[model samples]
Target chain A: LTRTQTYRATIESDIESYLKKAIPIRAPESVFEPMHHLTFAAPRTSASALCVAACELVGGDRSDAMAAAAAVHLMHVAAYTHENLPLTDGPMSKSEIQHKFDPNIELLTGDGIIPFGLELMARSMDPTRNNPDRILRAIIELTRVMGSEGIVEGQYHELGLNQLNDLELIEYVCKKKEGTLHACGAACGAILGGCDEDKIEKLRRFGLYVGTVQGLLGKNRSGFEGRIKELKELAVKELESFGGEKIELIRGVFEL
Target chain B: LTRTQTYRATIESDIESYLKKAIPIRAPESVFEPMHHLTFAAPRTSASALCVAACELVGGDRSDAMAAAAAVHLMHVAAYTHENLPLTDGPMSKSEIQHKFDPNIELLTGDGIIPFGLELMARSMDPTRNNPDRILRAIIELTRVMGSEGIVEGQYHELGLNQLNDLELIEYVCKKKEGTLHACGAACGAILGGCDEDKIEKLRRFGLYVGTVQGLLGKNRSGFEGRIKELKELAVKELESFGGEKIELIRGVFEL
Candidate 1:
């Protein structure tokens, strides 16, 4: 397999394992079954991959970052679950099956998964090796990204976007909706890896650029591919100071 | 006011202040406004009071336990919000206003508040004074009580209680539904107060007994009042070994 392909496989496999182990099926099958199903059924996004890669870039073990990576994915799934509800964005896909269940079930299931994500971060950290303050800082970052000022704000903006079709407004919504969580993943990994503030800020910016570029993709906008290429360069530039096989893998993951 | 009345007033004021300070009115007012409304609209319960009382019972400052107390209250509000939905119990007292808004808003608001509660716990911990593992342990306790195995299980059991009319089944549902979070409130306070495992267990049982007694109050069951008094005696017994001004207040708070 190609080198990029190898990294991709590893990232995907590890995240899958983390999800299953982190949120095991137990009692109250009614609640957990839906969370388990929704998480597995959602498409694999780059958020989790970005988390591990960012952790690796900062000289942290992939294992140390696995819980955070899984957490980012769960957060993404949660946003998607709520956004897809009939009252919100109105069922993007699998609407029929989702509608069959009580709406509150999906709602509560989403609620349950979020803390399950945070709990994973808390439980997975090695107290002896990891700084508890840093882990707590990471938790704070993830929650803030998913909280009202982050993704929820973006969703509200999207709902009310009909008045203004300006490119700037679209970019703002996209950044809030997509970029915030992506930035959160990278920044959290950086925090977990104990990088300096400057490095963490740079990774956050890189994630934001990547997210904005991804949002603009396939939107029939002119020069979008060129913009994506520019963002990729900028993303790679953020990691130029770091040197390792894992760092190179991260760069490759960013390479479109 | 009598001593018990004064204790009730103090508990109410502190919890109200904590709620306002912890979840301020930020952007996305659409989401937060409902949360604010629902939280204030709900009547006061013993969850937060129990947390503070339990903390004081274990020789911890009320300020030290304030975050956990607010967290317990937020979790209670979240559960009540979900339970009041039409999809669940077909709405409660404020269904008129609740119906005026999108049901999903209430749903998402509840989802949002659960994490907000956890974040409060994280932020409110005095790192200099409190251990991170203990804080994380408290987080785990709160989530478990709020998640599938705790409140959700109780809710599910309540929904499916049609076939079983046995007193044991009713009490079981009541314990899981009403008693779990109450147990969590007192237990978390015990944990935060640096209580030993044995002490924490006793406090948990004490809270569970208080919750069961409260649930059974005003029901037409035979000897209900006597049973409540018996449980109050049991609760007092658990705290008898500890003596302090706060402990005295706790005794007054639990007085039937």
Candidate 2:
């Protein structure tokens, strides 16, 4: 408990500082203000902490995962911004233009950060210093997980657009949207940590399980307690063969 | 002009093939469909053509810049999507959820393609074959150009959100939004073509001149013709010391 708390506090501070410097306020007040607001108001630091922790797990330093962690957090907040978009229901009406400076900050910021996050990852790839192949690989991991087949696919179904069975669809959303996003975060962290493929995959599955457990947390409609427990135990199982302080910290993520 | 035309036709076909392959039909019909539609219906091929043409001009093969050309096109189309967002002119009303599946395809796909373009760039970095540093640098060039300080700042001003003088503002928007964006594409193409710093900046400035001329074109709200001609001459002057099919093709862009 003590280790986890201290570790999380450190990660949170690192994340805050990285974001503050990366997204500093400047021109286009309309654009930067909303971006600043959304980033600062971002939900939690746990997933990013998992990234930094996962790096440490694989014998890598915390700074190795720092950029990836911040990228993960920014993408997560961008997702949050998208979820809160004022999506009107019923038949769409032909809208009239009525205001000056009619900039759609929500829409732009959500998408802009996709590019923002990419630059963040790429900036960390100082070829003379870091392993560019690993950085590029980690970058690919992130984009695909956020692309059409991943978050976009999950979001399409989650908005009640799917014709699948309710149980199946719910599990699908839980796994794809929530589970896979964090899984990618962990996977990228391991990649940055210089872990070999097997270790990265192990941490990925570990992240996938714990992520889904948390996803199922919201669907509790008060009855998913059984499967939720099932998922957590499985996450722990992935970390069983790995015993170290990093492993301990990563395992602590499951205590949620 | 014939050389430019034949080259453009070839580049257009190449861009089409690359995009079709990169963004194939997938699940989540809403996301992919808009992506497909926007990509196909995108305004013009001139910008992406510049990317390929610049690459070829710099002693690189056409295939080398194909991925980046397509990425440039996607980011361009995403910006177009942003420009057409249905922004209202009044204080925003609290919107109510009215429909069953309130998926904002325009908003989603616009942002989605940012990540899409990135993966396309990174995927091409088969580090064993390509220079990862060059790829990373090109990726940075594209991102920062599309970032808040670049296009976003210009768009902010274009929408009349600024208090600056009108003429200065219009010129700012033209140079930053249009000129710098194409400048970035040309610059990325040069980098991918394995050009040195001096050559890349020459193409970038050459692109900046021609791009600004085109940006100035729409204001036939009219009368910047004299300066436009002057700018084109300057573009020609940049090519004066260099002679090759690449330089000739790059000079052809000035005829825009």
Can you write out model 2's per-residue Cα lDDT over A1-256, one digit (the tens) per residue? 4877787888889878988987766545746766777787767736678888888777788888888888888777777666555544311212222222223566667656777877888888774678888888888877866767566666655766433347667777778767877788889888998887888898889878877776777566545677788888888888876777677666665684
Backbone clash total, candidate 2: 6
Report the lDDT of model 2 for residue B211: 76
Interface RMSD of each: 3.5, 3.5
Clashing pairs in 1: none
RMSD of each: 3.6, 5.0
**Clashes per prediction?**
0, 6
Report the lDDT tens digits of candidate 1 across residue range B1-256. Answer: 9887788689879989988875555534646777777777876668679888888778788888888888888888888777775543344223333443455566667767777888888887655756677777777778777767677766655655543246666676667756777788889889888899898888888788777766665234654556667778888787776676777677677664
Local distance difference test, per candidate? 0.73, 0.73
The docking quality of candidate 2, as DockQ, is 0.43
lDDT of each residue in A111-164, candidate 1, tens digit only? 677777887887775778756777777777777767665776666556544433
Candidate 1, residue B118: the lDDT equals 82
Model 2 over residues B1-256: C-alpha lDDT tens digits?
A: 4986777787888899889987756544657876887787767636688888888877888888888888888887777776665444321212222222124565567667877887898888755656688888888888876777567667655664333347656777887777877788889889998978998898888777877777778565445777788888887876665558677656665573
